[PDB]
Write a protein that binds this ligand. Structure first.
Ligand SMILES: C[S@@+](CC[C@H](N)C(=O)[O-])C[C@H]1O[C@@H](n2cnc3c(N)ncnc32)[C@H](O)[C@@H]1O
Ligand SMILES: [Mg+2]
Lengths: 382, 280, 360, 50
């Protein structure tokens, strides 16, 4: 056939244990930032039957009640009863937090000007952008997130009071290549599984999912009669979240970014402050990618940067425009060098990365969302 | 604001041009119309009927789609129900109606073509005109998704690959016209006719640059700073230039070829095509 | 020129996340060796003096988790408190839930190395391996188990393929004792590690070296940084090249398609390149709710044959039904622990790394 | 949490023992402060078998 290909991206709800951890981790980051903007935070989180474990390293002038913060986040997610498989009131919270290593502190940020502070680690990071949507994100991942977002919104609204927080959405789309750009044709398949109470019949849920969830989120243009709908496949899902499962911070890095598109350098966002370039440089790289697409230099773009620990400047910068620009890939690179300064000391100011609103990023993706600073394209001078 | 062949080079140009400048535009086509355009087959009578009788269109534009030979249709259906609602049809047509001997062929000149694509355009004009525009145009180029969408753009490969030489036709004089220039012309013959009737009868548009296949090839090469030395000059009209009088007499748009073809063909540069993969 | 840079990283066996991956797969092994059909989702978490095992297990095996954990940590090299960690004295906590009795996946291959892997990650991997080797040698006795490497290669675009030209930048951070000085360490990493791993042709005088760039790496391992299973998925795979759908490998059994189908997808990708059918390729596999519903092959224009032609070639040489995959790759056998460090791809020892001769 | 040194031949499901004991005691819901169904069960028993 034509240059057609399928592509799938998935998202999860706040109730998924990997994302519970991501959220908690960022809740502790927000708690610390509120009192100490320069709090060094690398907080991993572990969820299991009846348990939240905090582990990692934090150096902060802030004083934080980990119990309150952990338990309050589990409340905001909606696990408040044994019937749901988890209860913030009565779960086990364990804390294994130590100081950030001096050897890192000296080598990264001690006795140094803000602009000169070294990357908090070595690493590689990618930014991606695509004109297939207004948000400059893959349709597959945008729909995936929004679906979960609709579910929890409707859960909290009381319009669907039989919903529980754990949910997983998959979204497959039939794509056409277009001179390096990609074009979504139709939603091939939507899979939705979501946790629910014992009372509801299967057919009411599948009816609610389709009419009250999917049609509110997915444009009719993309849906048609051959669009496959697996709603609540294999029934069950009465219990969910941590109960009989195990989850961690940093195990949804693909869901958190580009749903399989672009590239990824391995690094996880949640629980980390700006000196950890896994997050700060990755947000920066997205800011670059989007700026180039919104600025009309290309239709699709992937950006790579890498860093060494204790070193301010990027070790490497790489631009691939997928042959969707009249300008050469080296021309774009040159434009990027004179409009952007990607040292973590400068990015923190440009993107304002000491604000305690990281918990907002811990679900429904870190990119393509309104009011995130990295989502606001910089005007380029060339 | 209904556009047929909206998936074609020409139709995408039309729909774009209306929608950006104060119209609620809705295109259609048979092959692969969704997601951007409500899908409709022309030869399906009830399908055509539904959307017109359901949309309430101010104006309609029937675009004759796809090119390349360079070697069927009942469009009367459209005019019956185009005029049924308060709106007028603009049947796009080709300079392949005149013989190509007495240029510039007038609006009111008498047609005399030959074989496939020749008179077969007139039958559509008969069917449109009887039972109540016919806007003729020359060979078209524009911002193509595939090189074969225009008889101008197909040549680009031959222009790039010096390693093997090719021969270009210097016989046939033509006026390569940017579909986008036609897109505006079409917006202008609609923007006015709703106010100033009774604008109808056979019409003529064309760009002002006279070229042959070979000259177009060398125009393209010199636009991209490429070698053209490998190009070789060597039942169709010799020169059927379209006397663009009526609509020019009123008061159109013209994009210089060397800029418009450069804008259209850069994504098919060898080096760019290599880079056009889904993943790096 | 029309050149470009690309970076990939790797980590050593003593890196906390990779510790967690190795234990997770040592656990898996211990179960399979007793029970071929053991189901396993084993998460490992590591932090100062603690190994926590967590997850779901359905097995007929009774495993001495304490021997498994301590043996792995011994092997890795954490045998004294002066190094931040000791298998002899550490705390092993178990929260596993034993009982007794859909998805994209990507393969990628490139002819730019003999191992058919991007040169970037290949060198990064190998750099960490020379460190472990020289530590165990006692050639560089001041070495300790935690380390990280990074290689930036300067590439040329060549007709869809990628052509390595030189090594632009190398980073090595490795945990060390308190005796050795900085200059000695740096002199050793360049001369004994880098020059022994990177082919001479790729090293020139303009090659930048960030060696012990932190200045001090005495505190390390779990003490330096919490470790978790599944946090090095790009190091496990293609180092930013190709593509990735999102699933961790370590701690899962073969019935998890995230792992077993990912290994198959590589196997296919590496077969096509080594069959000379393409200079470089990415293989996609949509499995559906049976055979894989859709398969795309992106040969990057580096194949004389069409994508459909390469597909057919794939169909008549490969059974890609999970059940058949485990037979063909012998996935019931308990040696996943050797995968959990130095990347799962690019090493001849693995069934998925032995190219199937293609008949088409 | 279970801690201590055991030397034995038995293969005990510490899941069932801990959960069934807590059930017997009557802790079966979050409203009561504790629930055998949902509670964390941590095992750091150092066991051998001669
Ligand atoms: C930079 S560290 C720590 C991450 C985070 N910044 C924190 O404070 O926990 C992440 C990895 O780098 C390496 N590392 C740890 N301490 C280091 C040091 N002092 N110098 C260089 N590299 C180090 C280890 O392999 C570790 O797993
Ligand atoms: Mg996670």
């Amino acid at each position: 056939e034509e240059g057609t290909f399928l592509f799938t991206s998935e998202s999860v709800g706040e109730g998924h244990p990997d994302k519970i951890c991501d959220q908690i981790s960022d809740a502790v980051l927000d708690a610390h930032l509120q009192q100490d903007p320069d709090a060094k935070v690398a907080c991993e989180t572990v969820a299991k039957t009846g348990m939240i474990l905090l582990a990692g390293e934090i150096t902060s002038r802030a004083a934080v009640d980990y119990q309150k913060v952990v338990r309050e986040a589990v409340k905001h997610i909606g696990y408040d009863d044994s019937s749901k498989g988890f209860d913030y009131k009565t779960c086990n919270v364990l804390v294994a937090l130590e100081q950030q290593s001096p050897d890192i502190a000296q080598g990264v940020h001690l006795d140094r000007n803000e602009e000169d502070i070294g990357a908090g680690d070595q690493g590689l990071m990618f930014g991606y952008a695509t004109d297939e949507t207004e948000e400059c994100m893959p349709l597959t991942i945008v729909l995936a997130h929004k679906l979960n977002a609709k579910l929890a919104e409707l859960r909290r609204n009381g319009t669907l009071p039989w919903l529980r927080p754990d949910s997983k959405t998959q979204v497959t789309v039939q794509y056409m290549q277009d001179r390096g750009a990609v074009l979504p044709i139709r939603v091939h398949t939507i899979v939705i599984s979501v946790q629910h109470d014992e009372e509801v019949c299967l057919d009411e849920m599948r009816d609610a999912l389709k009419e009250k969830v999917i049609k509110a989120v997915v444009p009719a243009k993309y849906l048609d009669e051959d669009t496959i709908y697996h709603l609540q496949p294999s029934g069950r899902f009465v219990i969910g979240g941590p109960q009989g499962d195990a989850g961690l911070t940093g195990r949804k890095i693909i869901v958190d970014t580009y749903g399989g598109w672009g590239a990824h350098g391995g690094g996880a966002f949640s629980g980390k402050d700006y000196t950890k370039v896994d997050r700060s440089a990755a947000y920066a790289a997205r800011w670059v990618a989007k700026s180039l697409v919104k600025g009309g230099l290309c239709r699709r773009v992937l950006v790579q940067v890498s860093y060494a620990i204790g070193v301010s400047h990027p070790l490497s910068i790489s631009i691939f425009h997928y042959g969707t620009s009249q300008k050469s890939e080296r021309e774009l690179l040159e434009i990027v060098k004179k409009n952007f300064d990607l040292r973590p000391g400068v990015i923190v100011r440009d993107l304002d990365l000491k604000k305690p609103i990281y918990q907002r990023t811990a679900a429904y993706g870190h990119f393509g969302r309104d009011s995130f600073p990295w989502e606001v394209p910089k005007k380029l001078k060339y | 604001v209904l556009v047929t062949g909206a998936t074609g080079l020409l139709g995408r140009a039309v729909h774009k041009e209306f929608q950006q400048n104060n119209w609620h535009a809705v295109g259609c086509g048979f092959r692969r119309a969704r997601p951007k355009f409500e899908q409709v087959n022309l030869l399906d009578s009830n399908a055509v009927h539904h959307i017109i009788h359901d949309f309430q269109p101010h104006v309609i534009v029937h675009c004759a789609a796809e090119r390349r030979p360079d070697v069927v249709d009942a469009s009367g259906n459209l005019a019956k129900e185009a005029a049924a609602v308060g709106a007028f049809l603009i049947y796009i047509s080709s300079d392949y109606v005149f013989d190509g001997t007495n240029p510039p062929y007038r609006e009111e000149d008498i047609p005399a073509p030959l074989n496939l694509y020749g008179k077969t355009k007139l039958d559509g004009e008969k069917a449109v005109l009887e039972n109540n525009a016919v806007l003729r145009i020359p060979i078209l180029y524009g911002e193509v998704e595939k090189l074969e969408e225009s008889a101008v753009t197909v040549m680009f490969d031959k222009v790039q690959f010096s390693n093997k030489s090719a021969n270009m036709d210097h016989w046939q004089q033509r006026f390569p016209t940017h579909v986008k220039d036609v897109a505006t012309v079409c917006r202008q013959l609609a923007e006015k006719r709703m106010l100033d009737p009774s604008i109808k009868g056979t019409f003529h548009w064309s760009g002002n640059e006279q070229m042959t296949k070979y000259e177009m090839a060398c125009a393209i090469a010199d636009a991209f700073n490429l070698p053209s030395s490998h190009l070789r000059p060597i039942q169709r009209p010799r020169n059927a230039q379209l006397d663009c009088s009526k609509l020019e007499t009123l008061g159109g748009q013209r994009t210089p070829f060397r800029i418009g073809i450069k804008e259209s063909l850069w994504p098919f540069l060898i080096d760019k095509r290599w880079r056009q993969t889904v993943f790096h």
